Amino acid sequence: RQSWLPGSQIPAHLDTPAAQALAGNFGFDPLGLGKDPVALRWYQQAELIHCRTAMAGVAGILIPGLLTKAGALNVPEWYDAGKVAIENSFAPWGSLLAVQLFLCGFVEAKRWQDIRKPGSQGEPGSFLGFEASLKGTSELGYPGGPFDPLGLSKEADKWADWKLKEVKNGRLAMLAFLGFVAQKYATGAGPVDNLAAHLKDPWHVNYATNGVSLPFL
Amino acid sequence: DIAGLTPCSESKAYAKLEKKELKTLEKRLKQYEADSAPAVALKATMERTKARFANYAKAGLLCGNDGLPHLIADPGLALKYGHAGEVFIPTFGFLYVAGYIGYVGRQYLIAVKGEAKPTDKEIIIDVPLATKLAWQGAGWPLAAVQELQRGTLLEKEENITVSPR
Amino acid sequence: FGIGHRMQAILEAHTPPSGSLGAGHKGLFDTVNNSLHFQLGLALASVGTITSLVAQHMYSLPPYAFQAIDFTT
Amino acid sequence: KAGNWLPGSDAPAWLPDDLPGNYGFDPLSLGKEPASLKRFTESEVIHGRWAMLGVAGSLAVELLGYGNWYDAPLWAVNGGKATWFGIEVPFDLNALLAFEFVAMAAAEGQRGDAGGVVYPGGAFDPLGFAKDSSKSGELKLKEIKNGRLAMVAFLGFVAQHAATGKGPIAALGEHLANPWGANFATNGISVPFF
Amino acid sequence: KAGNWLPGSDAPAWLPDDLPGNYGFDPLSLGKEPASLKRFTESEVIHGRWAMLGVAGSLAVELLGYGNWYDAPLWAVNGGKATWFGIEVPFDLNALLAFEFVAMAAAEGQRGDAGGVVYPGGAFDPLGFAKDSSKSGELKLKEIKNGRLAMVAFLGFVAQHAATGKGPIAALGEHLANPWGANFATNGISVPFF
Amino acid sequence: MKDFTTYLSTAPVIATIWFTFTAGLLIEINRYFPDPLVF
Amino acid sequence: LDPQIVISGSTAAFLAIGRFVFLGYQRREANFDSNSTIFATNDPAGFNIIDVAGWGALGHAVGFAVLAINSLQG
Ligand code: CLA
Ligand code: CLA
Ligand code: CLA
Ligand SMILES: CC1=C[C@H](O)CC(C)(C)[C@H]1/C=C/C(C)=C/C=C/C(C)=C/C=C/C=C(C)/C=C/C=C(C)/C=C/C1=C(C)C[C@H](O)CC1(C)C
Ligand SMILES: CC1=C[C@H](O)CC(C)(C)[C@H]1/C=C/C(C)=C/C=C/C(C)=C/C=C/C=C(C)/C=C/C=C(C)/C=C/C1=C(C)C[C@H](O)CC1(C)C
Numbered sequence A: 001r002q003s004w005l006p007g008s009q010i011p012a013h014l015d016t017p018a019a020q021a022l023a024g025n026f027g028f029d030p031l032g033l034g035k036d037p038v039a040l041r042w043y044q045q046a047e048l049i050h051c052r053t054a055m056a057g058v059a060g061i062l063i064p065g066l067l068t069k070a071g072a073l074n075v076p077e078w079y080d081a082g083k084v085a086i087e088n089s090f091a092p093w094g095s096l097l098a099v100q101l102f103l104c105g106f107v108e109a110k111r112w113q114d115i116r117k118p119g120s121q122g123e124p125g126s127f128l129g130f131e132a133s134l135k136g137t138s139e140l141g142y143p144g145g146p147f148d149p150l151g152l153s154k155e156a157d158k159w160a161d162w163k164l165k166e167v168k169n170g171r172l173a174m175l176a177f178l179g180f181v182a183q184k185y186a187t188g189a190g191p192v193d194n195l196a197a198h199l200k201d202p203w204h205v206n207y208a209t210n211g212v213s214l215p216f217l
Numbered sequence B: 001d002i003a004g005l006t007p008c009s010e011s012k013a014y015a016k017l018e019k020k021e022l023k024t025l026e027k028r029l030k031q032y033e034a035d036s037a038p039a040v041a042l043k044a045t046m047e048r049t050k051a052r053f054a055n056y057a058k059a060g061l062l063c064g065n066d067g068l069p070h071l072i073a074d075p076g077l078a079l080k081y082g083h084a085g086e087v088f089i090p091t092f093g094f095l096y097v098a099g100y101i102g103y104v105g106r107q108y109l110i111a112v113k114g115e116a117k118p119t120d121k122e123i124i125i126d127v128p129l130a131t132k133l134a135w136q137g138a139g140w141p142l143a144a145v146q147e148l149q150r151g152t153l154l155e156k157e158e159n160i161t162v163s164p165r
Numbered sequence C: 001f002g003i004g005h006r007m008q009a010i011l012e013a014h015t016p017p018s019g020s021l022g023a024g025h026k027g028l029f030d031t032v033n034n035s036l037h038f039q040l041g042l043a044l045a046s047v048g049t050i051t052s053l054v055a056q057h058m059y060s061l062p063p064y065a066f067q068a069i070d071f072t073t
Numbered sequence D, E: 001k002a003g004n005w006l007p008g009s010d011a012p013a014w015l016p017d018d019l020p021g022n023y024g025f026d027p028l029s030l031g032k033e034p035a036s037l038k039r040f041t042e043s044e045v046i047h048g049r050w051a052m053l054g055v056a057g058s059l060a061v062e063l064l065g066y067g068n069w070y071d072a073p074l075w076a077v078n079g080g081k082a083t084w085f086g087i088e089v090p091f092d093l094n095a096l097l098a099f100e101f102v103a104m105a106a107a108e109g110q111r112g113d114a115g116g117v118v119y120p121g122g123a124f125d126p127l128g129f130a131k132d133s134s135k136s137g138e139l140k141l142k143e144i145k146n147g148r149l150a151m152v153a154f155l156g157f158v159a160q161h162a163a164t165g166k167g168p169i170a171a172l173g174e175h176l177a178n179p180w181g182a183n184f185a186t187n188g189i190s191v192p193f194f
Numbered sequence F: 001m002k003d004f005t006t007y008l009s010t011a012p013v014i015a016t017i018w019f020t021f022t023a024g025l026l027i028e029i030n031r032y033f034p035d036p037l038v039f
Numbered sequence G: 001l002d003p004q005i006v007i008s009g010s011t012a013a014f015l016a017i018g019r020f021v022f023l024g025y026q027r028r029e030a031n032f033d034s035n036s037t038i039f040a041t042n043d044p045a046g047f048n049i050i051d052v053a054g055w056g057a058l059g060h061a062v063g064f065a066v067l068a069i070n071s072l073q074g
């Protein structure tokens, strides 16, 4: 049994056969937020959405930032890309956010309805024939049809491992974005610049030297 | 600006009040020596006064005709004119700590309620269980919302005692 | 003279269909017309509210001549 | 049932299947009581009919060039005379109130005395398009759907006028000229923080 | 079936063999249900017919020297008059949308009221090219294949225009004049690293 | 020691220790952050 | 504005909507609303003197309101 703390008392709610079926089960729940099975299922969906969203965002911040350091691209910093992208644009940020909220609300409402009732999106005569493809697999949060065009989820032997590479990576991405924010309020530069400045002198450039992360020192 | 008030960084009464406080402190300081404990204490108080006035003017507070700051309690005005730090953020901070303490106490009561003698657990606090619940109460809003959605937060009408009407 | 209303009918015809108020105002005409303490309580509540209204309106909106200059009054 | 307003959600039990426009949309459970649901049906049909006529009139006046629906009663407030289709009308505001009040009182009085009738027929159907009750089902749905759409359209007319100051056609032309740059998120009234 | 899209891969078990243009290409399994497959079949045939007409019209108008397909509604952006084959047309954009909308709505309503008929025939087949059902299936394969090619061609038209700016005929001549110097890799937006 | 810990676990002793800890935390917070009126 | 025309028209109009429009509704509500005097009349629809006085009062009030509003010149 893999654990996040060797010797710590693993919670009973995380030891059930249903809880162990989730990917990345390391028995980490010191606050007991997953005692309720309904709450655990909802939080599992939230963790999956956060993992995918954080992975896409951190990728869109790290890859163009790494290409900017080289001569591949000239993408500005993530904390300044919004202003630069809205300057020479075709619409203000308010109109764009309104269209975004509408388009995101529709799909999130459909996802919410499928979470409330699995496979309910396949109601006949409701999506111009595309309702059949809107029914996900047996596991919540893992749909097929239009999603997953390559069909890599049909092989079960790697499926259980595939999900492990999706949650864990996502968790890392979730911390990555957090660092991106903290570093922004601690050094004032970008993440790639902070990485290079740290690699230049690791013994004197860290969180214990900026004076912000350790005010008592 | 809002309600006919002016910012503390541009109020004459605010500066006059600061000069009055510094004047009375300096007047009290002139009666002592230079390398004595009361003089150092008075200088420290004066530095604290200067830092307090500078910080209040730096925060963008709105002062009145008396030179004293004013708080904005309307959420719209606070979030629209940069006054959310006065009454909005501390409101949510107190809500978090209040629900935190309430949830910890409720969890302790429900936990000791099923034991043999709950009154002993009430007069003599079970420090290990109380400490565990105190550390676990960080997720109080999530646990409270999940409890409310499940219907286990409230007790039924038939299980509560009432008057004979 | 035939025309007009009956307070009992208006009271008995004011119950929401959702059952939020229970039986609504059914039987309120008999419990008020036959109880002098209920009528006295309603009258005193309205009178006290009107008295406070009088105090506020008279100091803010002076109705009598040369009344604002008289501070003691 | 014509359809499902929330794909994958169970329809309310108090809503009949043969009701026109029955999409199962009632989160507040307002039609749970059978008597209340009966009044709400005729109320919705009457509202849809009035809104359809109102939206058609507001569109026709601006499409022909006689101002918007908001500028229509502006003649009675500052020395003006009503013009219908470019023809002068010899009636003051006081005379219009008496005639409209008497006519509407008579019409609505007969309708109310009828007993909540939603589909009168007969004298109201001179062309006989709903003689058979078997084919009236596919035509009643069209009426309720067009009525709901016109209700939303009139509400939008009032909202866009109160938030911009221009008529319905004027807001359409401006939006067709600049869709991304001129919408509800750019008027400064709808969303204040945008 | 007309063949296999991916050699070595088995065709899906829900695709009928008698369907025209059946290549077993369905990795997303969108036509899993027979009800959705019928609608998608009619939609694909109609899309192919419209794509064929659109591609033929764009190529014809560009080869006849009447501008590219992108500069077709440009006369109604700045104010002008449309010219079909060099002959002036006195209809403006406001009147063109009305007649086209009315005629298209009537024709599409009549077509959709039949219940999704893909191959009507009769009045639409006066020459009798499909009198015998033995050879009717062979021409259907050609029809769906030409439609698929036309849809891909129209997608290519839009993509190459948004990537370069020149029209389909102007892009063909440019590519024939400089194949290594004028292609999808030299436009500048397909590959940002190059 | 069990009886001593049980005595220290009573309501007045626990209240005294808890209020002393809370008061000390608030006092030290105001000491290192003098005059906090806003956030 | 002529006072006679306005008052006469308002009174006649409300008496007409009281006798030919809202008579049945008022009679049905008065019946369900449940020493006295019965006012017998020869009107076929039972429009007694009490209803005439009430409708005439409403008509006169509305007519005088119209006259006053038009007198204000607004
Ligand atoms: C606890 C009671 C309470 C009271 C007495 C008020 C009172 C007020 N609020 Mg409010 N508000 C409250 C709770 C309260 N609020 C809460 C809990 C929230 C969080 C949702 C808000 C969020 C809020 C916002 C975002 C705004 C106000 C605003 C206002 C002021 C005018 C609007 C109004 O009266 O309509 C009641 C307020 C609401 C129903 C909230 C929606 C805002 C309405 C639609 C007004 C917006 C229109 C426009 C901006 C008005 C400004 C006109 C002009 C000065 C430019 C007014 C003094 C407005 C303001 O003055 O901006 C500085 C403003 O925009 N409030
Ligand atoms: C588990 C602790 C607890 C909880 C969850 C509540 C909760 C509640 N109380 Mg209550 N109360 C408590 C303890 C608690 N009380 C105690 C010890 C007293 C005696 C002083 C009171 C006296 C009291 C009165 C007179 C009233 C309430 C009321 C209420 C309700 C309104 C909210 C409020 O803040 O009121 C105010 C809360 C207080 C005045 C006391 C708070 C005391 C602390 C902060 C609570 C925790 C103390 C405890 C020692 C910690 C647990 C230790 C454990 C972890 C080892 C609410 C449901 C009101 C009501 O009737 O309901 C609408 C009301 O009128 N309470
Ligand atoms: C019949 C529905 C309808 C239509 C066709 C329009 C059309 C239009 N409106 Mg309008 N509006 C509507 C309803 C509608 N509105 C309603 C109900 C309200 C009150 C909330 C408003 C309030 C409003 C304001 C304040 C403004 C407009 C404006 C405009 C114009 C610019 C687009 C825009 O930003 O609007 C936005 C409309 C909404 C956010 C609400 C639309 C309601 C639904 C979502 C649309 C109809 C449903 C649609 C047929 C199918 C939806 C499916 C989809 C969600 C997937 C445009 C021509 C702006 C203008 O004047 O132009 C410069 C303007 O400022 N509208
Ligand atoms: C488990 C648990 C339980 C127990 O009981 C207790 C405890 C301990 C408490 C716990 C823990 C928790 C945690 C840690 C959490 C966290 C989370 C996160 C971090 C998230 C994020 C998350 C994150 C996310 C999503 C993110 C996303 C992002 C994005 C979109 C981005 C975007 C962008 C880009 C691209 C670029 C531009 O230029 C900018 C922007 C616009 C900005
Ligand atoms: C269903 C439900 C149930 C659940 O449970 C809950 C909820 C959600 C709440 C719901 C919903 C609701 C809603 C939405 C409502 C709305 C309505 C409307 C809009 C109406 C209108 C309606 C509307 C209407 C009638 C309108 C009408 C109009 C008119 C007549 C007009 C007139 C006119 C004209 C001609 C023009 C001129 O120049 C002026 C005038 C004179 C002015």
Ligand SMILES: CC1=C[C@H](O)CC(C)(C)[C@H]1/C=C/C(C)=C/C=C/C(C)=C/C=C/C=C(C)/C=C/C=C(C)/C=C/C1=C(C)C[C@H](O)CC1(C)C
Pocket (backbone or CB within 6 Å): E025, E026, E027, E028, E029, E030, E047, E048, E050, E051, E053, E054, E055, E057, E058, E061, E068, E069, E070, E072, E150, E151, E152, E154, E155
């Ligand atoms: C099958 C499947 C299944 C699996 O599983 C999955 C997936 C992959 C999803 C799939 C695939 C899909 C696809 C490929 C699609 C595509 C489509 C298209 C492209 C269409 C178009 C389509 C297209 C179209 C109609 C087009 C049309 C056009 C037109 C009419 C044109 C017109 C015109 C002309 C003459 C020229 C002038 O100057 C202008 C105009 C006036 C403008």
Ligand SMILES: CC1=C(/C=C/C(C)=C/C=C/C(C)=C/C=C/C=C(C)/C=C/C=C(C)/C=C/C2=C(C)CCCC2(C)C)C(C)(C)CCC1
Pocket (backbone or CB within 6 Å): G011, G052, G053, G054, G055, G056, G057, G060, G061, G062, G064
């Ligand atoms: C027999 C007969 C008949 C009838 C006739 C007649 C002619 C009747 C009538 C009647 C009338 C002709 C009535 C009227 C009336 C009136 C009244 C009843 C009134 C009143 C009053 C009041 C109450 C007022 C008040 C006031 C004042 C004092 C001041 C200012 C304000 C007001 C205006 C409010 C006929 C031929 C149809 C048919 C046959 C038989």
Ligand SMILES: CCCCCCCCCCCCO[C@@H]1O[C@H](CO)[C@@H](O[C@H]2O[C@H](CO)[C@@H](O)[C@H](O)[C@H]2O)[C@H](O)[C@H]1O
Pocket (backbone or CB within 6 Å): D108, D109, D111, D112, D113, D114, D115, D116, G022, G025, G028
């Ligand atoms: C902005 C201008 C437009 C706004 C105008 C609003 C004016 C509304 C006037 C309402 C007048 C009430 O008028 C009266 O209504 C009742 C109540 O339904 C109708 O009453 C009818 O339906 C009710 C049930 O609802 C039955 O009990 C009754 O027997 C029947 O007559 C009457 O036939 C009508 O005479």
Ligand SMILES: CCCCCCCC/C=C/CCCCCCCC(=O)OC[C@@H](O)COP(=O)(O)O
Pocket (backbone or CB within 6 Å): A083, A086, A093, A097
């Ligand atoms: C019921 C469920 C509700 C779910 C709601 C989900 C909300 C979706 C979240 C969206 C993220 C919000 C990000 C957009 C806001 C940040 C944009 C912004 O802050 O820009 C404004 C400002 O810089 C522009 O300033 P100028 O360029 O100086 O005008």
Ligand SMILES: CC(=O)/C=C/C=C(C)/C=C/[C@H]1[C@H](C)CCCC1(C)C
Pocket (backbone or CB within 6 Å): E109, E112, E113
């Ligand atoms: C934009 C708008 O308002 C709606 C247009 C919808 C249509 C034409 C749908 C029509 C049919 C469909 C495919 C289902 C069966 C009946 C119809 C008329 C053939």
